[PDB]
Design a protein around this nucleic acid. Structure first.
Ligand code: K
Ligand code: K
Ligand code: K
Ligand code: K
Ligand code: K
Ligand code: K
Ligand code: K
Ligand code: K
Ligand code: K
Ligand code: K
Ligand code: K
Ligand code: K
Ligand code: K
Ligand code: K
Ligand code: K
Ligand code: K
Ligand code: K
Ligand code: K
Ligand code: K
Ligand code: K
Ligand code: K
Ligand code: K
Ligand code: K
Ligand code: K
Ligand code: K
Ligand code: K
Ligand code: K
Ligand code: K
Ligand code: K
Ligand code: K
Ligand code: K
Ligand code: K
Ligand code: K
Ligand code: K
Ligand code: K
Ligand code: K
Ligand code: K
Ligand code: K
Ligand code: K
Ligand code: K
Ligand code: K
Ligand code: K
Ligand code: K
Ligand code: K
Ligand code: K
Ligand code: K
Ligand code: K
Ligand code: K
Ligand code: K
Ligand code: K
Ligand code: K
Ligand code: MG
Ligand code: MG
Ligand code: MG
Ligand code: MG
Ligand code: MG
Ligand code: MG
Ligand code: MG
Ligand code: MG
Ligand code: MG
Ligand code: MG
Ligand code: MG
Ligand code: MG
Ligand code: MG
Ligand code: MG
Ligand code: MG
Ligand code: MG
Ligand code: MG
Ligand code: MG
Ligand code: MG
Ligand code: MG
Ligand code: MG
Ligand code: MG
Ligand code: MG
Ligand code: MG
Ligand code: MG
Ligand code: MG
Ligand code: MG
Length: 245
RNA sequence: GGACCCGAAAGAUGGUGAACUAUGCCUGAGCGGGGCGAAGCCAGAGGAAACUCUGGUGGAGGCCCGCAGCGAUACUGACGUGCAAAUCGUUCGUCUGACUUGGGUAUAGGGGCGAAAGACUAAUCGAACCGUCUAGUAGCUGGUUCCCUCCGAAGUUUCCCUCAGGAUAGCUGGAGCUCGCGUGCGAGUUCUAUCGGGUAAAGCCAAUGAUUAGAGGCAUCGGGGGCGCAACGCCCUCGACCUAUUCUCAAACUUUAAAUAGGUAGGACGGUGCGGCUGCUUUGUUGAGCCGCACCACGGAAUCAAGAGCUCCAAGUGGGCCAUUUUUGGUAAGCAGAACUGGCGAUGCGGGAUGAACCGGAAGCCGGGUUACGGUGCCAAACUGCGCGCUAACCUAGAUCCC
RNA sequence: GAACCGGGACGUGGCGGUUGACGGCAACGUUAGGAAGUCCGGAGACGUCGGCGGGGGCCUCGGGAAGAGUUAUCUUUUCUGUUUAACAGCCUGCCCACCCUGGAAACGACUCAGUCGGAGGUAGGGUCCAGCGGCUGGAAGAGCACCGCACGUCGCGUGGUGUCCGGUGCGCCCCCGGCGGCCCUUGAAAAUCCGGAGGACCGAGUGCCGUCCACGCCCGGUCGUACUCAUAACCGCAUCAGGUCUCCAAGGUGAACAGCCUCUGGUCGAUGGAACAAUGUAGGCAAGGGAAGUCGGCAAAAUGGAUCCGUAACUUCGGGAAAAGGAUUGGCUCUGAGGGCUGG
RNA sequence: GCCAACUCAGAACUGGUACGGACAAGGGGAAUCCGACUGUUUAAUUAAAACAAAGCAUUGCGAUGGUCCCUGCGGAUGUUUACGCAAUGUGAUUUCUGCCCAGUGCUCUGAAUGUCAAAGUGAAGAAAUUCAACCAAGCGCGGGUAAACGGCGGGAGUAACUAUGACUCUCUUAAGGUAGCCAAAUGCCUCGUCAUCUAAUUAGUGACGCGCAUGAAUGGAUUAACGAGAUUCCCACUGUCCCUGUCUACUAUCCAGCGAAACCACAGCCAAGGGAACGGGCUUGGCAGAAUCAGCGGGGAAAGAAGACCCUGUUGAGCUUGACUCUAGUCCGACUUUGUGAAAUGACUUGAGAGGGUAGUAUAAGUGGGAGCCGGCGAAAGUGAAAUACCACUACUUUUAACGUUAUUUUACUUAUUCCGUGAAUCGGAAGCGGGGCACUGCCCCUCUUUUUGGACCCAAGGCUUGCUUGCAGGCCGAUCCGGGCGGAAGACAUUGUCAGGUGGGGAGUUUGGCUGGGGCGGCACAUCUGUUAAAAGAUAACGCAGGGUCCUAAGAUGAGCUCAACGAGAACAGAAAUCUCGUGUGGAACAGAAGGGUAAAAGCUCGUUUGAUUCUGAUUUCCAGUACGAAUACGAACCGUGAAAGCGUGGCCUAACGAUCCUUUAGACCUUCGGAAUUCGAAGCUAGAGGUGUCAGAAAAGUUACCACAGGGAUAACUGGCUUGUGGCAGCCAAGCGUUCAUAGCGACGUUGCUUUUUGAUCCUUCGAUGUCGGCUCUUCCUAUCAUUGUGAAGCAGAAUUCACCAAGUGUUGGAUUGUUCACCCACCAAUAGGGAACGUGAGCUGGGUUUAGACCGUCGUGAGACAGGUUAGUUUUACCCUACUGAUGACAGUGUCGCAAUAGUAAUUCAACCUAGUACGAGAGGAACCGUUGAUUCGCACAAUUGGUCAUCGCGCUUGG
């Protein structure tokens, strides 16, 4: 008869993201004439740590195409990039790690990161540390490029979508064991109030379908309907299978 | 309808709280002295080499003892109308981190928040607090205010999600009305005459069923012994069978069959003789009812009759209990359940020492007389009255229905 | 009494015109020493822990002088105080950072720990940075201590002496510097201020144009400000043994803001008196036995600091571990070892 | 030479061996269980094994998305992007994680139309409307899934002693407990069996295992280190105890001052009696003497609270789901938003064409004339059930356009709509400057200027041309022209809105009968019949006794004929039992069913004819209120059956076999109404049946609560008390037998009479506005049904020992292991280690180990919430100052004092050992007493401190730490 924790998540106010010390969103430059037709050069000034994000970020300074001022950008760092490096963004940019190129100019089998979904969206795919997308094939008839995403899915995107050459830096982070609750506490303190987690079978019936019983047990199948209403949809949602492979 | 008065656990609606506590966020602050001695580094020794070893340096850890801080294990200590609606004393856990803490800020009631105890959300939490709907509804508990006088119950029937309730009939009050004065439309009573019964008892030597014992007979058709190869051959024992007897039995057996109790009748609403009506009935004014006229009818058994009949409105009651006799279950019960009557309940009074039911007896306020039951050695009113026997208790002799 | 900040306006003097200073090889220095739209950088501006070093205050030892305490005996001894603010100038120049000469293995330099060097070490010579560093002015005239004269009811009167010279440190509080450890944690923003890139535009010859320089002049609103901050000034119905954030922090013992005693400061506020029955509450002891008590060793007792010797099974090899088990500990009189500065 | 600090290590000397001198400050060891550890938690009874945790595993999701919030609009995750976010389970490391997809879930690019709404389409009708096809998701079917919920049994045969079963086959239901582990925090029996630990062990440890009911991420096994966690043992230690004593402070005490509260019908001495079954009051007795002080915990069934346990109410509430009825969300179809075009494919139109036999070649598929048809067939018959010849139309399978209908797909456009990016900064076309080839003057093919470097980059130089002569100012190129789309993506799909179907404990509301020797479980005594209880009219109770929702066109109606069961005697197979003959035959047969009645030319059996099992209403009986229903009975008014007729028949031979209102539906009338008038559909009326309420005078209805609540109930359970005494315990009587013979020394079978309330039952009288619920500890008293001790009788009593019995309750009846234990069982001592009451004595006397709140684990059960007579661990014990009682203390008792008497009340002593008797009596031996006397001792009681021991704040003396 009580709202469950998963339900309470949506209202927020204690489950909102912790973003006080973050350095702003990481994204490509806004797509413009220079990147569409030629190439534009910037310089990497700093490599910084973004709290709550495994991958390091890169500060890049560009010369504004048509204004007398500096254009400052924050890119998701690719492995191998260093301070003082020159980054080239555009259709005519060379195929080097750290450069941002339109997928139409990236040959097949290339490893890229921060791939745009819609032309000009400034990058939404393969942004986490150690992750990357792979260019599979091109279709000039409809101007569409096929990519393999980190999850293994194959997606078709417009060939004008941009992507940075190389993989995201910081790979191998999840290999290290944490060994203690304090490390997880520190990890999630800068992410959100999602830790520690209380098991449903440890609660009373009033606040969870798994609660109750003189023994600790679910008492009914943990697989639930895809259309099960909020508050009832707990456990393995719409599972096509369970158990070991 | 507030509905005689007071009372629920709840439900609904609209508002108020994160000054406590829970969690996230922002910005500040706080945490002796010791122990162990990880990486990294320096030097030396052994060895053919590989490599091994030793002594220093350094200071890691959700590491250890421990002060402050934070918390609260045991005494199940103190106190337990306390210093205190959670405190005090000793003891105890942790103490550089998942650490402690101030202020600001966010989350508000079927909502929040929860390292999860249904915990916390202002001494309020398995749904906060404040006002209102609201005099919420209660077959349930408690109260329900002057006097005398008259009458005066019920715990039983049927129906009800009915079993602590209600309606219904019965019991009761009030109002009367119709008549009547012994010629009485009557009666919890007898008498006379007529009917029904299957209990008590009795019966099995009567049907059905149960059951003991012997006696006399019988078989080409029972088990054995003897005489025998067998024999429908012979002699005996026990069994069946027949006959006449015999012990003992029945709520769901019975021929017979009480006591008590049940029904009907004993005139004025009768009888007799004529005539009439019918569409009913008959072969038949043959019957069956009914209707007119004439005559007779001493009231047609006893006793009593503080009279008989009729109607309307309505209260309370619908938990009963006890006793002689009859009687079911139960070892029995101050157990549980039925029949008739009476009693207590609703009722005092004398007796049984004492007592709701036993015995007596029922009652306005008094004087006198006499009794009922029970008593007359004292307590305590009335004889140590007149008489006959029994008992002698070295066990507390014995001493009055229920008891 | 002596300073500072912000704002306003001018006057005097100074500074530049090679229109927009000079010096240094350089780091950079000097009180001044153009400039508009536009653009760029820095400060503000940041976690935590450990060692080391510097500064201020405190603590502490010795000497000089002033006063006081003790003095049956000893005590050149015991006690108190012996001060220097903001601000201005000059000097100095921690640890770092930076610059010039030069070119290094037989490698050297170097910290407690690290670390650094042909991407230029050692060495020689310099620049800059901090300071809560030094001297001077402020400022001895002030404050403090001591010794005198005077009114002796009301002179907040009047005068003198001193305020000096050294040592020491794993000491305590605060600030700072520079390294190192930790993170799947990397530990605010803005107002505001400073600097820089560019040079449109701008002036004269005995006066003009500028000037962040020196001195002089004027002004600076509104509200809070007492007191308590707690065993009686807040909350708990109270003058309630509870609860309520934080700053300062002496001496002795001792590892120690442990316990105990003491100095400054505070305080004797818990209604008082008499007696010392039982039963209680709190705190001890108890011959012999030693858990037989009790559901149960509940409670209490025992052990305990430091130094030396020594330490098993098991083990995730990190521990177990202070395992277990033994010895010592006072006072007094000595001995030895462990340092700094100066001088060829 | 001048200064400087406290660290370390040694050596003498020395004190009453004192010296971390106060203070400060681990007890240790050997094991088992749980949880890895650090951390967190029920503020005010539970700190834990519970929660979290790192590690492990599973699930969804690529943004047009997953999860979630929101009335709506829009939002959180998201300053994000799979090394991520979201939803779960397990719980370090090590090792392992077996079989089962039948069930419930979840899931799928699977077959298919078995079912499937609204809208839309077609037929009929005057229309309302009814019929058909088409028909989404979902459901059904199929597949996959167990680190999803969960499950892991039984049977038969089989090895050469037996036993088991490697092996083979089978059933429910998919499989049949694998590796492991165990009387476990998990085992009932159970205190299981064995070993060990102890003197003794329901405890601990190890082992065994058909294990009521162990078992593998509902995780199994182990595990160093850790723990205010649960357990066992050992060492040290001790006032826990033997067994108490003593010391200090503060109280209590007394005083000055000050000064409440709880509670109070009236009050307060007892024994018994009865009584509402436990009185302070009543009855009968005992007694009983002013006024006061300090305690005390027996009583006041003391106070504290309208019992929280249990039951009842037509009272809730938290939670759950396979309960009833709904609902947010979600999926799906239609219409709308919604505009502009082109093609395929499947049906329906018509239109031409091909095919078929169960047995036979064959359309003989179906039909008519065929005797005649266009050389060909019948005209003959082989199958035959029905003819081939010439005509079509009828059914089934099968191709394709002229016209038209319908449905599903593919695809085109962008302006509606939706989404993305930007400070809407170069978008579309063309042309020029340059670079390539061709062959010859034109073509086509490409580019927009920036890639060794951690620099800077803006506000136009230049050329041409005007005002007039420039303070300077105005135009073009530099800087191509033209496009009145900021740049893209999806796109009439998505999205909004309205209806329609599915899903929907996420959420709302509600329900979850009654009787009942408490309630539940059980049963139905709830409608209802027979016999009996039932007491010879009727009526009559119990969860008394023994039993009983249909069936029949005949098993109803009528007429006729006959007589059944059984027995006796006879007849081949044939007999106990087949069919047949005669005789007897009162029903001993049959009549649907339970039982009781009833019936013989019948009510039974056979046969003939039949539908009175018919229509119409009234009356009566049974039940009973003299209501209804059911059932039955006697007439009346009709039509019939049967019989010759009287007559009989209104269902079953009689006594049971059944059902209101509302609604639905059927039958009846030339019936009534639709209210402005007519006709016709439709609807509504009247009369009689049918669909049913079995809780049967008739709601529509699942659990749980230990998180719990309210109104009440002693109308009703869980103690004591009261009745009873079956059961338990303790006695008696008779005498068949036992006892070498002998019933009775000692016993007592078969029977039979009693007593007791320390057993357990039975009951429900008292108590539910509360009488504190086990056991132990302490303390007193009482009983005898006597264990020991004193005195006796009897013996199958030689002695010793033992047994039976009589006076007898004066005295005593113990220390320990295991268990919470009562109980039990062992060890030990002893004269003995008897049995019991006192509200199952005794909690304002204690304790709190157990039972019996809330936390938590295991096993079994349940889908679940949760349950458990199963186990386990942690879990607040309140108040006396009132009256009485009792213990002591003043006082009263007629001046004061001393010495005394004395009723009455209380009372106290107990048991054992040794020596001698005595190796005596007795006895064949073995063995083996007792009186007297002497010396000690046990338990208990009253005193006392010479000695010993204890006690210190003599604060007495000494020593000593820090200040
Ligand atoms: K809710
Ligand atoms: K959290
Ligand atoms: K968890
Ligand atoms: K559950
Ligand atoms: K579980
Ligand atoms: K009324
Ligand atoms: K607050
Ligand atoms: K904070
Ligand atoms: K609420
Ligand atoms: K009632
Ligand atoms: K008879
Ligand atoms: K008979
Ligand atoms: K009534
Ligand atoms: K800050
Ligand atoms: K640091
Ligand atoms: K200042
Ligand atoms: K400038
Ligand atoms: K002030
Ligand atoms: K203050
Ligand atoms: K013990
Ligand atoms: K025990
Ligand atoms: K810790
Ligand atoms: K812990
Ligand atoms: K704890
Ligand atoms: K846990
Ligand atoms: K989303
Ligand atoms: K799981
Ligand atoms: K399955
Ligand atoms: K399945
Ligand atoms: K199976
Ligand atoms: K495991
Ligand atoms: K613990
Ligand atoms: K007083
Ligand atoms: K008496
Ligand atoms: K009720
Ligand atoms: K509740
Ligand atoms: K659409
Ligand atoms: K729906
Ligand atoms: K639901
Ligand atoms: K009939
Ligand atoms: K009923
Ligand atoms: K419920
Ligand atoms: K008995
Ligand atoms: K009772
Ligand atoms: K009670
Ligand atoms: K005991
Ligand atoms: K505890
Ligand atoms: K005298
Ligand atoms: K005496
Ligand atoms: K003495
Ligand atoms: K003494
Ligand atoms: Mg579990
Ligand atoms: Mg707050
Ligand atoms: Mg500790
Ligand atoms: Mg009534
Ligand atoms: Mg009778
Ligand atoms: Mg009488
Ligand atoms: Mg009289
Ligand atoms: Mg540290
Ligand atoms: Mg010092
Ligand atoms: Mg001076
Ligand atoms: Mg400049
Ligand atoms: Mg207040
Ligand atoms: Mg020291
Ligand atoms: Mg919306
Ligand atoms: Mg479908
Ligand atoms: Mg096995
Ligand atoms: Mg285990
Ligand atoms: Mg009595
Ligand atoms: Mg109550
Ligand atoms: Mg009722
Ligand atoms: Mg006949
Ligand atoms: Mg009906
Ligand atoms: Mg004899
Ligand atoms: Mg006796
Ligand atoms: Mg006795
Ligand atoms: Mg289960
Ligand atoms: Mg006496």
């Amino acid at each position: 008869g009580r709202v469950i924790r998963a339900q309470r998540k949506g209202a927020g106010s204690v489950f909102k993201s912790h973003t006080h010390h973050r350095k702003g969103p990481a994204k490509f430059r806004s797509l413009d004439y220079g990147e569409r037709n030629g190439y534009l050069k910037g310089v990497v000034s700093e490599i910084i740590h973004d709290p709550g994000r495994g991958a390091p970020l890169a500060r890049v300074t560009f010369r504004h195409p048509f204004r007398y001022k500096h254009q400052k950008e924050l890119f998701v760092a690719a492995e191998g990039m260093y301070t003082g490096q020159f980054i080239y963004c555009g259709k005519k940019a060379n195929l080097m790690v750290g450069n941002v190129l339109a997928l139409r100019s990236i040959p097949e089998g290339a490893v890229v990161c921060n791939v745009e979904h819609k032309v000009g969206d400034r990058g939404v795919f393969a942004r986490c540390s150690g992750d990357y997308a792979i260019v599979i094939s091109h279709n000039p008839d409809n101007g569409t490029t096929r990519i393999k995403l980190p999850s293994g899915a194959k997606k078709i995107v417009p060939s004008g979508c941009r992507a940075m050459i190389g993989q995201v830096a910081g790979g191998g982070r999840t290999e290290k064991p944490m060994l203690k609750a304090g490390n997880a506490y520190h990890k999630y303190r800068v992410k959100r109030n999602c830790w520690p987690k209380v098991r449903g079978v440890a609660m009373n019936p009033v606040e969870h379908p798994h609660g109750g019983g003189n023994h600790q047990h679910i008492g009914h199948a943990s697989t639930v309907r895809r259309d099960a209403p909020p508050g009832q949809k707990v456990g393995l949602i719409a599972a096509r299978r369970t158990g070991r492979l």
